[PDB]
């Protein structure tokens, strides 16, 4: 049954295939401009638009976007005459949902649409820094490392739930408990009925994430408050200093753009035969094999642009650097390092300056998310950020038991890593780390604001 799986994940990877070369054929891109990552996640972005419908679901569409409802869009990048010419190009909704379902053999093909939306969450998540968006909710701008998933649409389902981190929920919490203290109405009536329902959803979700009994103690206290207010918040900030020593599990999903789907699929390749997994070594060998281009702009560096993408391919972003180092081959820098911007070029840069380059995409190594393991120390702002703010308020049996499990905390996911040589996972390779590196991707940040567009 464990195959089964295997043609189903398979179908859908076909599916995004076979729609990215319709989309190719439809908007008359070269090879080259079929392979252009940009030009990818504008064709991505059409799709998740036209099933959403102005829900918030699959994306997040802008209120200017909301002047033509019935049409979705955007930049679409073409090499003319030396130069790289962009071109807003507007299709009907409905056109884009028929041209999906036909790619898909007539299905509605969701877990596609999921697909492509987690890539462009795990892509923001390498990319924008979040640290306004956690000074707003009262958070400490130090657990920037729990925010997996925190540029989702807000109205994401379950599909969105699994790769949301622990400080993501926490945030989204913080966020409905304060419009709750706001308006006394906010839990009555048929609003209240089903946003208390919401409410206890969230904090089952946040609590399957704690992996020890006494956080998902705690969380059980923040869902039982009826009428929930400033002291929720106070634990549920609690709870998220705690998942920076007692980590929670939080589901990565390596999700790769249609431009590197589309053309394994364009040459010739039956992915519902051959079965396609994510967790293994499926995901490297597209990667291996692919070639993909992006626009650059000036005083940025190719290869670290090439970072951005490869570690948002791989879903890394929250992952220890020196294990990523060693897998890739070459020093995976923290984001504060990186001489790049966004993939997404803005509708106000101009384009005269830029140019484009190959991503460099392969690794040295490959490995399965999951026996001799060395486990690395966290950095000292994690240590202060999470052994802080327990001198005053609130105190109780199971926050003192909560901090003496951080405290006395034994050295929480890691990675196996297999030689390219090595197919069938029969070699596990013992890591050996460069301890010069830094350790947090966010060591040091310096990248935009996500909310800032």
């Given at each position: 049954n464990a195959t089964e799986i295997?043609?189903?994940?398979?179908?859908?990877?076909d599916g995004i295939g076979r729609f990215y070369i319709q989309m190719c054929t439809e908007l008359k891109l070269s090879d080259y401009e079929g392979r252009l990552i940009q030009n990818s996640l504008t064709i991505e972005r059409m799709v998740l638009s036209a099933f959403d419908e102005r829900r918030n679901k699959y994306l997040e569409e802008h209120p200017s976007a909301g002047k033509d409802p019935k049409k979705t869009g955007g930049p679409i990048y073409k090499r003319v005459d030396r130069k790289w010419m962009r071109e807003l190009v507007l299709y009907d909704k409905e056109e884009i949902r028929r041209?999906?379902?036909?790619?898909?053999?007539?299905?509605?093909?969701?877990?596609?649409?999921?697909?492509?939306?987690?890539?462009?969450?795990?892509?923001?998540?390498?990319?924008?820094?979040?640290?306004?968006?956690?000074?707003?909710?009262?958070?400490?701008?130090?657990?920037?490392?729990?925010?997996?998933?925190?540029?989702?649409?807000?109205?994401?389902?379950?599909?969105?739930?699994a790769v949301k981190g622990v400080g993501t929920m926490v945030m989204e919490l913080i966020r409905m408990i304060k419009r709750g203290i706001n308006d006394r109405n906010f839990w009555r009536g048929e609003n209240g009925?089903?946003?208390?329902?919401?409410?206890?959803?969230?904090?089952?979700?946040?609590?399957?994430?704690?992996?020890?009994?006494?956080?998902?103690?705690?969380?059980?206290?923040?869902?039982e408050s009826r009428n929930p207010g400033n002291a929720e918040i106070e634990d549920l900030i609690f709870l998220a200093r705690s998942a920076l020593i007692?980590?929670?599990?939080?589901?990565?999903?390596?999700?790769?753009?249609?431009?590197?789907?589309?053309?394994?699929?364009?040459?010739?390749?039956?992915?519902?035969?051959?079965?396609?997994?994510?967790?293994?070594?499926?995901?490297?060998?597209?990667?291996?094999?692919?070639?993909?281009?992006?626009?650059?702009?000036?005083?940025?560096?190719?290869?670290?642009?090439?970072?951005?993408?490869?570690?948002?391919?791989?879903?890394?972003?929250?992952?220890?650097?020196?294990?990523?180092?060693?897998?890739?081959?070459?020093?995976?820098?923290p984001r504060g390092k990186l001489s790049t911007r966004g993939v997404?070029?803005?509708?106000?840069?101009?384009?005269?300056?830029?140019?484009?380059?190959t991503l460099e995409l392969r690794s040295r190594y490959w490995a399965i998310r999951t026996s001799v393991q060395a486990n690395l120390p966290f950095d000292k702002p994690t240590i202060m950020a999470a052994f802080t703010g327990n001198t005053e308020g609130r105190t109780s049996d199971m926050r003192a038991e909560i901090i003496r499990m951080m405290e006395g905390a034994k050295p929480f996911q890691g990675r196996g890593v297999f030689e390219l040589s090595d197919e069938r996972a029969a070699n596990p390779i013992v890591p050996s780390f460069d301890m010069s590196n830094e350790g947090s991707y966010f060591f040091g940040d310096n990248a935009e604001e996500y909310d800032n567009l």
């Open positions: 295997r043609a189903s994940v398979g179908k859908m990877i041209i999906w379902r036909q790619a898909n053999n007539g299905d509605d093909a969701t877990a596609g649409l999921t697909h492509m939306m987690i890539w462009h969450s795990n892509l923001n998540d390498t990319t924008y820094q979040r640290t306004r968006a956690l000074v707003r909710t009262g958070m400490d701008p130090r657990m920037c490392s729990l925010m997996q998933g925190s540029t989702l649409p807000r109205r994401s389902g379950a599909a969105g739930a009925r089903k946003t208390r329902s919401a409410y206890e959803r969230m904090c089952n979700i946040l609590k399957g994430k704690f992996q020890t009994a006494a956080q998902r103690a705690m969380m059980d206290q923040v869902r007692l980590r929670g599990s939080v589901a990565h999903k390596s999700c790769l753009p249609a431009c590197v789907y589309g053309p394994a699929v364009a040459s010739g390749y039956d992915f519902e035969k051959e079965g396609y997994s994510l967790v293994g070594i499926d995901p490297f060998k597209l990667l291996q094999n692919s070639q993909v281009y992006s626009l650059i702009r000036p005083n940025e560096n190719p290869a670290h642009k090439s970072q951005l993408v490869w570690m948002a391919c791989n879903s890394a972003a929250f992952e220890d650097l020196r294990v990523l180092s060693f897998i890739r081959g070459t020093k995976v820098s997404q070029i803005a509708s106000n840069e101009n384009m005269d300056a830029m140019e484009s380059s």
